[PDB]
Amino acid sequence: FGSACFKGAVADKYLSKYGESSTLLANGKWTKDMAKADIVAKAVLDWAVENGASVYCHWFQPMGSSGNSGQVHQSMFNFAEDGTPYYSFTGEQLLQGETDGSSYLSIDPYSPIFLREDTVFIPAAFVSYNGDALDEKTPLHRATDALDKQTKRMLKAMKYDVGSASVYANIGLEQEIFLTPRHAFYRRPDLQFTGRTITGKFPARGQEGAFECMRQIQQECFKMGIPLKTRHREVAPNQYEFAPMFGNAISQVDQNLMIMQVIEEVASEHGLAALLQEKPFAGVNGSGKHNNWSIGTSDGLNLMNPKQVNAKTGNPEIFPLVMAAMVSAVDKHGDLMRAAIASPGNDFRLGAMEAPPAVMSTYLGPSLTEFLNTVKNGSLGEYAPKKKPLEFGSDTLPSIEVPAEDRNRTSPFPYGGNRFEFRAAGSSQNVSLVNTVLNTIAAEAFKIVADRLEAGEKPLAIAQDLLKTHDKCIFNGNGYDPAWPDEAVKRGIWRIDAGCDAINELDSAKNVTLFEGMGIFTAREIQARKSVLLGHYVGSVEMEALTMIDMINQHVIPSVKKADLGNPSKLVDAVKTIKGAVAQIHGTEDEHKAATLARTLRLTTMVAIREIIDEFESRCPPEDWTLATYSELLFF
Amino acid sequence: FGSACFKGAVADKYLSKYGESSTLLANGKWTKDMAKADIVAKAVLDWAVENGASVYCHWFQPMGSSGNSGQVHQSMFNFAEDGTPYYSFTGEQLLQGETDGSSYLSIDPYSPIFLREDTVFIPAAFVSYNGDALDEKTPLHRATDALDKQTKRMLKAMKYDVGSASVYANIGLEQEIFLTPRHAFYRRPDLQFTGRTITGKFPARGQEGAFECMRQIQQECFKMGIPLKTRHREVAPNQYEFAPMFGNAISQVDQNLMIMQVIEEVASEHGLAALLQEKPFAGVNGSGKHNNWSIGTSDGLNLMNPKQVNAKTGNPEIFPLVMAAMVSAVDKHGDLMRAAIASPGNDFRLGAMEAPPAVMSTYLGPSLTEFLNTVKNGSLGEYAPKKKPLEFGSDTLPSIEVPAEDRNRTSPFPYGGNRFEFRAAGSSQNVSLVNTVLNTIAAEAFKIVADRLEAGEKPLAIAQDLLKTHDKCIFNGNGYDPAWPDEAVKRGIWRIDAGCDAINELDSAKNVTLFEGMGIFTAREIQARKSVLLGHYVGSVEMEALTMIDMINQHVIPSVKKADLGNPSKLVDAVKTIKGAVAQIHGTEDEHKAATLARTLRLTTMVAIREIIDEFESRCPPEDWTLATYSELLFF
Amino acid sequence: FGSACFKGAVADKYLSKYGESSTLLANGKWTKDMAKADIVAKAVLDWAVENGASVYCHWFQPMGSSGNSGQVHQSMFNFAEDGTPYYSFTGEQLLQGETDGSSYLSIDPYSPIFLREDTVFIPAAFVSYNGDALDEKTPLHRATDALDKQTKRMLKAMKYDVGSASVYANIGLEQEIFLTPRHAFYRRPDLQFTGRTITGKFPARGQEGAFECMRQIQQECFKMGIPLKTRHREVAPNQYEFAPMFGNAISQVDQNLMIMQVIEEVASEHGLAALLQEKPFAGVNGSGKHNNWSIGTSDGLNLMNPKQVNAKTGNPEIFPLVMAAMVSAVDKHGDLMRAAIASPGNDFRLGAMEAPPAVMSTYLGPSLTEFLNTVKNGSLGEYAPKKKPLEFGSDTLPSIEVPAEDRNRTSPFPYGGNRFEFRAAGSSQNVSLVNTVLNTIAAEAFKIVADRLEAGEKPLAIAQDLLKTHDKCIFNGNGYDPAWPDEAVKRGIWRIDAGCDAINELDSAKNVTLFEGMGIFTAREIQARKSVLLGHYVGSVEMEALTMIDMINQHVIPSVKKADLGNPSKLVDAVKTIKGAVAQIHGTEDEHKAATLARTLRLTTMVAIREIIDEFESRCPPEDWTLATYSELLFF
């Protein structure tokens, strides 16, 4: 409906009062202007005042804030000498904010100003006083700008003009959320403090208003201006996927963050709880958040649609090169993609059956694979996934046409026909970093091909050179094969089984040269980003450890003593071990070393302790097990 | 009413808006057409939008999915550049879907596109990318096609033309459901995870809104347009039978599946639970799902009605021949029927008092038996079950007329006067497989008789030959006699006491030659089907075993310790034994071997453990028994 | 009101639509007719459809079904090719049903087709496929027909014509029901499974919406067409008697069964429970169901009204003769009456203070006794119980007139002034068998007197002969005297203290010759009836035993252990004893032997066990006694 999103027709409704329209809001040039800034400030002031809002808060995503997004509130109504609450909201209040960098928020014109409860949320970018990008919005803006400029350069170098069209990253975010009874949520301290179950015996080993909740989600998003296309269940119990369609990554990351938020408070309203963690329950499918990422222009041109590219430009050569470029990007910076997804919860999703393993290998599909191979051999044609017939052996049953591309779900970076469905991204982790890295690697490859074009090199020769350089990362087989990681390592594809090492790869020489090359970060900027990510990971692991300590001492040991399930001295020794592990974590200074110790602890010592807890729970009566068990959380 | 079923008059209501009618929807040829596909897509889009539906999900039944039916949701409203939810639903969205074959859904035009909640469910057939039938809908379609073509061939070979009339399997599905207090259902983990009570002491040894619930079922089926004829209680406590009348088997299997789904969700709404398992309670009558199967043409001709056949065709020989055909089919493929009913729950129903034993012997009734015997001797007349008088010795009581056929309830395949009431089918198991095997064996028999007719053989001689070949399977006496199984074995009738062996009989040489002969399956197809069925059975047994482990470790042992009912070391040994049994189950590779071990475990070791648990429960106070006892589940 | 009873004016309301009236329904000849059958089928179809009913179920009482009455449901609305629920109910659906005889229901035209909830209940008689009467309705019909024909014969033999008037048994059924808090009912397993308390200590030794409930009963019976005359309390706590007035026994037995049912579900609605057992509580008055039985013609002539007989016929000799006839009947078949009342619960009512002892001796009253004695001496006058004055010694208090018959309550078959108030009948047991035996013995006596009249013998001489033959059974004194049974045995009156022996007397040579003489049963029929009754009794005793096993193992032993009321080893030995007794019950083949063992068990072993449990309960605190005690059940 747009009633809670100052964009498009709703924005125009009040911009026309001052002779403006949503066209002014779309480009974002109004922030540079002064009179337009005050005009839109008055318009949004009115919009909020009859929407039932009186406070405007600037909105931002702090460094490594997976939950999830901070804000600063300010009253937009003042009091004069008479002492009356008269609404007064100026452009300076709209653009500038206040928030400490810590060991001056600025609005994001490309993100829609939206509204919740009686407060209008104004998305904004967060920096330090020096100027360092201390958020995820500013790096993503820099990455998108570099992507746009490099795309324009390389298109112009091959005799194609986009005019004033703006290039960006069109992304859909298949956000998956677990829904739990809030009564059981209150009985699981790990979910309260970490969002994922650090322990709990899954029933039957493991080798396998609720409808009101997401209908309220859907009606909210209608009134909220979010085109939430499809919400539906998933394989795991009470795991609901919301898949808004593609849009500018700048807006879409904020869309995803606020969708996460509104889902959280709606579940709280419904007497439930929205676990956004990547793997809130061990033994079930991980709650992944696929990022359908693609290159999209303002006028709707998509670089992953060869037919659309040929129709709009007339040069078939565009689609392979950029694809090869993207392939090169992966083969150049797959670790960085592994770095992007490296989040506390996501370390329980890589390598499992639901999510692809830690090998960052792209999947172009079979037919596209031999098409690019033929291009590399010196034969460029036109990729076209012709649909083959499919009959079911019955005349009554219709004969359908299905694409010859036998689609794959085992790849971290598969080409889903018309886009890259990067499935490695996690639900709790905001994809902002993922889009930053994807945009910057695309921009690097695009700059390389543009420079080669400007040097006079034929686009063909660039295609063969890049393909023969980076065809190793292309993979089409079953990625869930246990014999795949070592084969990929032999091939040379990026593969980091450790999230800690993945993050530590951020400040590598190649990655740093990339970041200043595309202007995404400075050395200090990327060093601070890596430091924050490592600290976030180690802190999440530390709080999981402390919650385990509290669970053992408060729930597991008392339950064992009450039910007389044997000597709990093993659990006491486990508490000593985990406390010592936290001691070494806090006693080491190297951030990567601390992260490695934390990951080793989480994946080995806490897993063994969790197995011990599950053994003690299987023999514990339900009344004695104070912690709510997986049966209550999942099956309700 | 049809308000939630896009069929018949309701479908015509919106097809007339585009100049069409329900006649187009009936034949199913619209899927082949292009413009008609878009027209019906628009019509169903409207039907959904003013019914209050915004998401369309393709609907299918996976291999061996007894619960029960998967679906993929997609929004039929899109957003343009302005960002408004405009409803747009095309034919491509209607026909083709997305779902992984796994180690491209297509619509089922012969199944009614129906609606539930705010989602329109579109029944569809599920295959693999290769083309292999990975569902039950496609095998049923192939079986019905083969049945129709063979029936048409054999009718034409004997000078009878059906024109454009379509032959199919008219079936009624007497679906029986147990209704349990959901409060007790949540206290029985076995019902939560397996649907049937793996343990629990029945009171008194065993040798013997609720009305709001099925009135809501009835009003739903009205507003949903399911002609649910009769819902009524049964011998067992809270066991309710729903008996929708005859219809095309292709549509009727979906009708049964969705009836199961709606009953489950309504019971959940009413604070109850709908146990669909075959034998949810040991000691009471099994919840069977009788399949009233018959051969029915489009114009209403029924092959089991000799009078109707004579009236419509004028050739009395049709009814006996075809009868022997089905008789031959049974005597040729009774194991296959035993294979069809072989489901995890159904192994607790065969051989009991409620359901017929594991001897797949048909019952034609006495008078029909000597009629067919006389035909075999070379004397064909006209079967006619004349009704004999029945007086009660009182002039006040009316003198009635009852058919001379003393009907039998102890047979697995009795001829209920005008149909085959195959009572061996189970409630949880979808009858789709049962209809596939019945249709393919009928098609084989009809093909044999048609080939003999085309060779010039008199229909009479075929009748005597087939009857003298396959009269052994005919049985009229008491099937519940303990001396019946060995008598049938000496007779040569098919009898598989083991569901595992029944399923393993699917890939037999004769069965495989049947399946490619009728085109129902390929060798790979039937091998995959047998593999899936065996895996489903062994997995269900494995989860019953694991749930048992959880019950003793979590409930039975703590209850014994609290109530001081003696040493629970016997239960600990039982847990060790069941864990070891699961270990051998997971340690063997042969699927049939695994299924045999699982069945032996379930029928012997788990039964003995259940007896021990019942002994401990009989001496346990009700408050100490955390698990809800049969008295609470049944008598509420 | 008749709104839920298709009879009389309500039936005529819709029979007039087809030119018919309730006169057609009254005689029952419409079932023989074809067009009338379809007409009444359409009429009842309408009556149901605007009463809010959609399903018709045939209704019957199975052999020895004391609860209570089975039914088979069928939809009376069908679906055509269009698929619409069109109401279509034919005569064949009305008359013919389906139900297994087991180791083809036909309507009862003399019982009113009635209606409950959304289902129209159609009373029907249940037989086997062979033709054997496998219910109680058909024996009652045969007995009533024999009674009518013999009464007509004997009246005509003495120059009295009844024309087309129909003779039958006019009976009132003083049905007594105990009402218990359903919360307490759920805490007593015996009441759940047997309906009577097998144990429980009565407070104070034993030597002594609720109003909403029976007002709802009364308004239901008003809307139900049931003329429930008087509902009122009784001596025992919460024991309510409902006394519908006299009517045809064929209809009145169904009235009683459906009253029992509707009371059960009304009590369930009111959060109560309707205990229908004969002696649901040991120590209080038994819940007897007096059968006020008399001979009544269609035009209202009553054979127990001498004044009415003289007025209508003019021959005073009718009333004495027939009386001696019934007297003879008792003196010939008192055991059979003792057989008729022989039911599981009723064995706890015979011999107590509330109900007369096991001596089946009739009570004609003093004045009638010497009147019949004078007739036997050869002096017949006219019986007339002239009312004697009764003054209270106060002029203010009115002087009343009271019958000289000092009425008695200690007799099993007293003559209550104008009818036989056979008080031995039990509440749970349906009186259908009682009416069968009374009608057949009356028919035998009438046949004997009619044969003597046709031989030319004077009615007087028959009177003296029968009186001197059968005057021993006449008793006027206090039947509760402990010395009465021995005096009656010396007199030769029938007296069976054992219900098992009472039932076993059914197949005696005299009883069998009676049953084929009046045509009530064949030898196979009576043998099956006796077998069913003995099996019912032994099964009820066996489930009482099993429920007791469950109570001691589940409630009494845990309560004793928790409250530390001494060694419960005595209760363990009692469980061993009762289990062994059930073992001998199941190990013997003679049905009478099994019943005798069951009765001995019930009256001795479980009585002693009940005394032990009461001793343990008296010392048990109320919270420790999980079973609900008599104080909670009776005083609420």
Coordinates of N, CA and C in Angstrom, one line a residue, chain A residues 487-567:
Chain A
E487 N 39.0 -32.2 -3.9 CA 39.1 -32.0 -5.3 C 39.1 -30.5 -5.7
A488 N 38.3 -29.7 -5.0 CA 38.4 -28.3 -5.2 C 39.7 -27.7 -4.8
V489 N 40.2 -28.2 -3.7 CA 41.5 -27.7 -3.2 C 42.6 -28.0 -4.3
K490 N 42.6 -29.2 -4.8 CA 43.5 -29.6 -5.9 C 43.3 -28.6 -7.1
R491 N 42.0 -28.3 -7.4 CA 41.7 -27.4 -8.5 C 42.2 -26.0 -8.2
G492 N 42.3 -25.6 -7.0 CA 42.7 -24.3 -6.6 C 41.6 -23.4 -6.2
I493 N 40.4 -23.9 -6.1 CA 39.2 -23.0 -5.7 C 39.4 -22.6 -4.3
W494 N 38.9 -21.4 -4.0 CA 38.9 -20.9 -2.6 C 38.0 -21.8 -1.7
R495 N 38.6 -22.1 -0.6 CA 37.8 -23.0 0.4 C 38.4 -22.7 1.8
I496 N 37.6 -22.1 2.6 CA 38.0 -21.8 4.0 C 36.9 -22.4 4.9
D497 N 37.3 -23.6 5.5 CA 36.4 -24.2 6.4 C 36.2 -23.5 7.7
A498 N 37.1 -22.5 8.0 CA 37.0 -21.7 9.3 C 36.5 -20.3 9.0
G499 N 35.4 -19.9 9.7 CA 35.0 -18.6 9.6 C 36.0 -17.6 10.1
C500 N 36.7 -18.0 11.2 CA 37.8 -17.1 11.7 C 38.8 -16.8 10.7
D501 N 39.3 -17.9 10.0 CA 40.3 -17.7 8.9 C 39.7 -16.9 7.8
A502 N 38.4 -17.2 7.5 CA 37.7 -16.4 6.4 C 37.8 -14.9 6.7
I503 N 37.4 -14.5 7.9 CA 37.5 -13.1 8.3 C 38.9 -12.6 8.2
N504 N 39.8 -13.4 8.8 CA 41.2 -13.0 8.8 C 41.8 -12.8 7.3
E505 N 41.2 -13.4 6.4 CA 41.6 -13.2 5.0 C 41.2 -11.8 4.5
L506 N 40.4 -11.1 5.2 CA 39.9 -9.8 4.7 C 41.1 -8.8 4.5
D507 N 42.0 -8.8 5.5 CA 43.1 -7.9 5.4 C 44.3 -8.4 4.6
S508 N 44.1 -9.4 3.7 CA 45.2 -9.9 2.9 C 45.6 -8.9 1.9
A509 N 46.8 -9.0 1.4 CA 47.4 -8.0 0.5 C 46.5 -7.9 -0.8
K510 N 46.1 -9.0 -1.4 CA 45.2 -8.9 -2.5 C 43.9 -8.2 -2.2
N511 N 43.3 -8.6 -1.1 CA 42.0 -8.1 -0.7 C 42.1 -6.6 -0.4
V512 N 43.2 -6.2 0.3 CA 43.4 -4.8 0.6 C 43.6 -4.0 -0.6
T513 N 44.4 -4.5 -1.5 CA 44.7 -3.8 -2.8 C 43.4 -3.7 -3.6
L514 N 42.5 -4.7 -3.5 CA 41.2 -4.6 -4.1 C 40.4 -3.5 -3.4
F515 N 40.4 -3.4 -2.1 CA 39.5 -2.4 -1.4 C 39.9 -1.0 -1.7
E516 N 41.2 -0.7 -1.7 CA 41.6 0.7 -2.1 C 41.5 0.9 -3.6
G517 N 41.6 -0.2 -4.4 CA 41.5 -0.1 -5.9 C 40.1 0.3 -6.3
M518 N 39.1 -0.3 -5.6 CA 37.7 0.1 -5.9 C 37.2 1.2 -4.9
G519 N 38.1 1.7 -4.0 CA 37.7 2.7 -3.1 C 36.8 2.3 -2.0
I520 N 36.6 1.0 -1.8 CA 35.6 0.6 -0.8 C 36.1 0.9 0.6
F521 N 37.4 0.6 0.9 CA 37.9 0.9 2.2 C 39.4 1.4 2.1
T522 N 39.8 2.0 3.1 CA 41.3 2.2 3.3 C 41.8 1.1 4.1
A523 N 43.2 1.1 4.3 CA 43.8 0.1 5.1 C 43.3 0.1 6.5
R524 N 43.2 1.4 7.1 CA 42.6 1.5 8.4 C 41.2 1.1 8.4
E525 N 40.4 1.4 7.4 CA 39.0 1.0 7.3 C 38.8 -0.5 7.3
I526 N 39.6 -1.2 6.4 CA 39.4 -2.6 6.3 C 40.0 -3.3 7.6
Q527 N 41.0 -2.8 8.2 CA 41.6 -3.3 9.4 C 40.5 -3.2 10.5
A528 N 39.9 -2.1 10.6 CA 38.8 -1.9 11.6 C 37.7 -2.8 11.4
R529 N 37.3 -3.0 10.1 CA 36.2 -3.9 9.8 C 36.5 -5.3 10.2
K530 N 37.7 -5.8 9.8 CA 38.1 -7.1 10.2 C 38.2 -7.3 11.7
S531 N 38.7 -6.2 12.4 CA 38.8 -6.3 13.9 C 37.4 -6.4 14.5
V532 N 36.4 -5.6 14.0 CA 35.1 -5.6 14.5 C 34.4 -7.0 14.2
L533 N 34.6 -7.5 13.0 CA 34.0 -8.8 12.7 C 34.6 -9.9 13.6
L534 N 35.9 -9.9 13.8 CA 36.5 -10.9 14.7 C 36.0 -10.8 16.1
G535 N 36.0 -9.5 16.6 CA 35.5 -9.3 17.9 C 34.0 -9.7 18.1
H536 N 33.2 -9.5 17.1 CA 31.8 -9.9 17.1 C 31.7 -11.4 17.2
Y537 N 32.5 -12.1 16.4 CA 32.4 -13.6 16.4 C 32.9 -14.1 17.7
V538 N 34.0 -13.6 18.2 CA 34.6 -14.1 19.5 C 33.6 -13.8 20.6
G539 N 33.0 -12.6 20.6 CA 32.1 -12.3 21.6 C 30.8 -13.2 21.6
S540 N 30.3 -13.5 20.4 CA 29.2 -14.4 20.3 C 29.5 -15.8 20.8
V541 N 30.7 -16.2 20.5 CA 31.2 -17.5 21.0 C 31.3 -17.5 22.5
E542 N 31.8 -16.4 23.0 CA 32.0 -16.2 24.5 C 30.7 -16.2 25.2
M543 N 29.7 -15.5 24.6 CA 28.4 -15.5 25.3 C 27.7 -16.9 25.2
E544 N 27.9 -17.6 24.1 CA 27.4 -19.0 24.0 C 28.1 -19.8 25.1
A545 N 29.4 -19.6 25.3 CA 30.1 -20.4 26.3 C 29.5 -20.0 27.7
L546 N 29.3 -18.7 28.0 CA 28.8 -18.3 29.3 C 27.4 -18.8 29.5
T547 N 26.6 -18.8 28.5 CA 25.3 -19.4 28.6 C 25.3 -20.9 28.8
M548 N 26.3 -21.6 28.2 CA 26.4 -23.0 28.5 C 26.8 -23.2 30.0
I549 N 27.7 -22.3 30.5 CA 28.1 -22.4 31.9 C 26.8 -22.2 32.8
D550 N 26.0 -21.2 32.5 CA 24.8 -21.0 33.2 C 23.8 -22.1 33.1
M551 N 23.7 -22.7 31.9 CA 22.8 -23.8 31.7 C 23.2 -25.0 32.5
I552 N 24.5 -25.4 32.5 CA 25.0 -26.5 33.2 C 24.9 -26.3 34.7
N553 N 25.3 -25.2 35.2 CA 25.2 -24.9 36.6 C 23.8 -24.8 37.1
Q554 N 22.9 -24.2 36.3 CA 21.6 -23.8 36.7 C 20.5 -24.8 36.4
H555 N 20.7 -25.5 35.2 CA 19.6 -26.4 34.7 C 20.2 -27.8 34.7
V556 N 21.2 -28.1 33.9 CA 21.6 -29.4 33.6 C 22.1 -30.2 34.9
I557 N 23.0 -29.5 35.7 CA 23.5 -30.2 36.9 C 22.3 -30.3 37.9
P558 N 21.5 -29.3 38.2 CA 20.4 -29.6 39.1 C 19.4 -30.6 38.6
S559 N 19.1 -30.7 37.3 CA 18.2 -31.7 36.8 C 18.9 -33.1 37.0
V560 N 20.2 -33.2 36.7 CA 20.8 -34.5 36.9 C 20.8 -34.9 38.4
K561 N 21.0 -34.0 39.3 CA 21.0 -34.3 40.7 C 19.6 -34.7 41.2
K562 N 18.5 -34.0 40.7 CA 17.2 -34.3 41.1 C 16.7 -35.6 40.5
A563 N 16.9 -35.9 39.2 CA 16.5 -37.1 38.6 C 17.5 -38.3 38.9
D564 N 18.6 -38.0 39.5 CA 19.6 -39.0 39.9 C 20.0 -39.8 38.6
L565 N 20.5 -39.0 37.7 CA 21.0 -39.6 36.4 C 22.5 -39.9 36.4
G566 N 23.1 -40.2 37.6 CA 24.5 -40.5 37.7 C 25.3 -39.3 38.2
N567 N 26.6 -39.5 38.2 CA 27.5 -38.4 38.7 C 27.6 -37.3 37.7

